[PDB]
Amino acid sequence: KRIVACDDPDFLTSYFAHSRLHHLSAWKANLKDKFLNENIHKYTKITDKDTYIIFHIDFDCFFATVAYLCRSSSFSACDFKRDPIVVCHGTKNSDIASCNYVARSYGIKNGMWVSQAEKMLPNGIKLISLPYTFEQFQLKSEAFYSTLKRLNIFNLILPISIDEAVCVRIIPDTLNARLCEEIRQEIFQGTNGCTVSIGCSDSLVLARLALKMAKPNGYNITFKSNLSEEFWSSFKLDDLPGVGHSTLSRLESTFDSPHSLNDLRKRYTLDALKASVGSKLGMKIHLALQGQDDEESLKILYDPKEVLQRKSLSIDINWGIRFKNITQVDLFIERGCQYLLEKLNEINKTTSQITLKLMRRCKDAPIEPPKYMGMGRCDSFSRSSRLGIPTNEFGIIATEMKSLYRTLGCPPMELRGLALQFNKLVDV
DNA sequence: TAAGTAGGGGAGGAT
DNA sequence: ATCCTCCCCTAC
Ligand SMILES: Nc1ccn([C@H]2C[C@H](O)[C@@H](COP(=O)(O)OP(=O)(O)OP(=O)(O)O)O2)c(=O)n1
Ligand SMILES: [Mg+2]
Ligand SMILES: [Mg+2]
């Protein structure tokens, strides 16, 4: 109890031990790495020639399911099929990391604050809050990835996240369904009762949309040639990979509030799209509306080893930042460089470019924000330098980081987040 | 109270 | 035209 402050040497350790988002990133980094280690000697690239089917397999409301199966004895009255359940730390402006399908029938979403969520519940319905079980999430994930390997279905299994793989079958030329049913059952068994859904298709996009359509505990096939208006009609605009809130808001402002992908698909033209959301995103949406992948997403198939290679390394801290003087800032920066170099050295690399980035309180914003210890509303400031020679040297990197800070000139009492980045990584 | 980061991509200056 | 820096955005 009593939370470790930002001027304490053990701050990173304690914050990261508690941050589900730090865990997400770490798990992701390590899975990519395990993938490179496991395939150093295997041949990997898929070609133009190849014909393939994608199975996109993902646990259903992952943290909520896993935290329910391991729920402490206090919560035994609790029922997963009948009660709305969230995993979070607090009771007010605290992020819901995962909610079960009961909560989502009230409109509760991942990443909503608890206070916001409880407001959506009618009289007589209670939110149940479960705590994080970081260890168990990882055990379930290992069961998951080992099970997939053990069945002998895929030519490749690309880890995407702690609870999600893109698994590919190379076809040389109805089983697709028997395969989805089998995977689902073996994972439910391997995992002691966690549920996975599957989207299967002949492109990464449609596999992803199919995954959504299948979602609570099911599978869906849909190929490029199965596309109907019924299908497009069932998706919000942000159900496209690569579309999030700001693109959604741009799409709405451009094409008179389409409410589903079918509406969009009916009103859009390429150039209007390109002009709305950028030219590359525009093109990707266009291809997606025809069930087709853009060239960028396809790299993960043609050169897995290149995409999964780590090209940068960083810390990004945006909660609990409160400093009174520059000496504190420097010590924190040094400590952050000690943490990062230890990671640099673990992966046998050096850097030749570094960036410091900071969130500074907006001139308008209250000194204390509604989120307890939160960054509140901020401006970004950013500065990078190329290093003379690739190096892993503390003296060189910490000195330049502290110098990047004086150049941005954010008074310490105004700092509300800090990021330390090694931007280009040179193998030893 | 309450708990990031990798990597695409664009705008605009530099070349 | 093409590259580089400092953002912005999305994912999970
Ligand atoms: N804003 C977010 C989004 C996700 N996650 C964590 C919670 C999830 O359990 C996990 C997986 O991301 P998903 O999008 O897959 O979330 P779910 O698995 O909970 O939902 P779904 O059943 O829609 O896949 O990572 C998080 O902490 N914060
Ligand atoms: Mg999931
Ligand atoms: Mg996922």
Which CATH number goes with the domain that contains A147?
A: 3.30.70.270
Q: Which residue has the tokens 């646990």?
A: A59
What angle do helix axes A62-69 and A134-150 make, rounded to 10 degrees?
110
Structure tokens at A206: 């449609």
H-assigned helices in A170-293:
175-190, 204-214, 229-232, 245-254, 261-267, 270-277, 279-288
C-alpha dist (Å) from residue A214 to A30, A104, A192, A376: 28, 15, 21, 37
The whole-angstrom separation of Cα A96 and Cα A67 is 13
Indicate which atom in ligand 1 lies nearest the CA of residue A62. 9
Q: Judge whether A344 and A313 are in contact, CB under 8 Å.
A: yes
Statement to judge: residues A165 and A53 lie in one domain: yes
Q: Which of A192, A154, A187 is nearest to A58 (CA)?
A: A187
- Domain-embedded: residue A389: yes
Q: Judge whether A410 and A403 are in contact, CB under 8 Å.
A: no
CA-based R_g, chain A, Å: 23
Structure tokens at A222: 């849909």
Structure tokens at A79: 């029922």
Query: Of the candidates A205, A222, A239, which is a domain's last residue?
Result: A222
Determine phi and psi for A233, rounding to 5 degrees.
Answer: -80, -15
Statement to judge: residues A338 and A206 lie in one domain: no
The whole-angstrom separation of Cα A232 and Cα A236 is 9
The whole-angstrom separation of Cα A22 and Cα A339 is 14
Full DSSP string of A140-154: HHHHHHHHHHHS---
The whole-angstrom separation of Cα A87 and Cα A85 is 7
Q: Which residue has the tokens 């409410």?
A: A259
Residues lining ligand 1, Cβ inside 6 A: A 20, 24, 58-63, 97-98, 110-111, 163, 215
Q: Judge whether A58 and A211 are in contact, CB under 8 Å.
A: yes
How many domains, in total, are found in chain A?
5
- Domain-embedded: residue A335: yes
Statement to judge: residues A186 and A251 lie in one domain: no
Q: What is the DSSP letter of A3?
A: P
Statement to judge: residues A57 and A172 lie in one domain: yes
Q: Judge whether A287 and A263 are in contact, CB under 8 Å.
A: no
H-assigned helices in A308-393:
326-346
- For chain A, the residues before each gap (C–N > 2.5 Å) are 173
- Domain-embedded: residue A1: no
Protein residue whose Cα sits closest to atom 26 of ligand 1:
A97
Using the mean position of ligand 1's atoms as its centre, give its distance from the Cα of residue A32 in Å: 19
Statement to judge: residues A23 and A74 lie in one domain: no
Residue A150 CA from chain centroid, whole number: 26
A148 CB contacts (<8 Å, ≥6 apart)?
A57, A154, A157, A165, A167, A183, A187
A157 CB contacts (<8 Å, ≥6 apart)?
A145, A148, A149, A165, A166, A167, A168
Structure tokens at A101: 């399908």
The whole-angstrom separation of Cα A4 and Cα A53 is 49
- Domain-embedded: residue A2: no
Using the mean position of ligand 1's atoms as its centre, give its distance from the Cα of residue A238 in Å: 15
The whole-angstrom separation of Cα A153 and Cα A16 is 36
Structure-determination approach: X-ray
- Domain-embedded: residue A4: no
Structure tokens at A74: 């206090």
The whole-angstrom separation of Cα A413 and Cα A333 is 16
The whole-angstrom separation of Cα A342 and Cα A330 is 18
Strands A219-220 and A196-201: parallel
- Domain-embedded: residue A216: yes
Statement to judge: residues A300 and A322 lie in one domain: no
Query: Of the candidates A156, A189, A222, which is a domain's last residue?
Result: A222
**How crowded is residue A204: how many other Cβ atoms within 10 Å of its Cβ?**
22
- Domain-embedded: residue A230: yes
Torsion over CA: A233, A238, A242, A246 (sign): positive
Q: What is the dihedral of CA A109, A111, A114, A119, to 10 degrees?
A: -40
For residue A146, is it left (φ>0), alpha (ψ between -120 and 50) or beta?
A: alpha
The whole-angstrom separation of Cα A192 and Cα A195 is 9
Q: Is residue A164 marked as binding?
A: yes
Query: Of the candidates A311, A342, A374, which is a domain's last residue?
Result: A311
Structure tokens at A162: 């702690």
Using the mean position of ligand 3's atoms as its centre, give its distance from the Cα of residue A163 in Å: 5
Distance in angstroms, CA of A278 to C1' of B9? 8
Which nucleotide is at minimal CA–C1' distance from A28?
A: C12
The whole-angstrom separation of Cα A150 and Cα A139 is 16
Q: Judge whether A112 and A96 are in contact, CB under 8 Å.
A: yes
Statement to judge: residues A17 and A43 lie in one domain: yes
Statement to judge: residues A234 and A214 lie in one domain: no
Geometric angle at alpha carbon A311, from A336 and A402, rounded to 5°: 30
Q: Is A302 exposed, middle or buried (0-12, 13-18, 19+ CB in 10 A)?
A: middle
Amino acid at A412: P
Statement to judge: residues A287 and A414 lie in one domain: no
Q: Which of A10, A19, A14, A31 is nearest to A132 (CA)?
A: A19
User: Domain residues for A31?
Assistant: 9-47
Distance in angstroms, CA of A179 to C1' of B2? 43
| A349-361 sheet: strands from edge to edge | A313-317, A415-427, A349-361, A378-391
A350-373 as b/e, with b when 16 or more CB fall inside 10 Å?
A: bbbbbbbbbbbbeeebeeebeeee
Statement to judge: residues A148 and A103 lie in one domain: no
Statement to judge: residues A116 and A156 lie in one domain: no
The whole-angstrom separation of Cα A35 and Cα A37 is 5
Determine phi and psi for A380, rounding to 5 degrees.
Answer: -75, 140
Q: Which of A410, A417, A411, A325 is nearest to A374 (CA)?
A: A417
- Domain-embedded: residue A367: yes
The whole-angstrom separation of Cα A165 and Cα A32 is 11
| A196-201 sheet: strands from edge to edge | A156-161, A164-171, A51-59, A196-201, A219-220
Q: Which of A426, A138, A166 is nearest to A310 (CA)?
A: A426
> For this experimental structure, what is the resolution in angstroms?
2.5
Determine phi and psi for A29, rounding to 5 degrees.
Answer: -55, -45
Statement to judge: residues A171 and A185 lie in one domain: yes
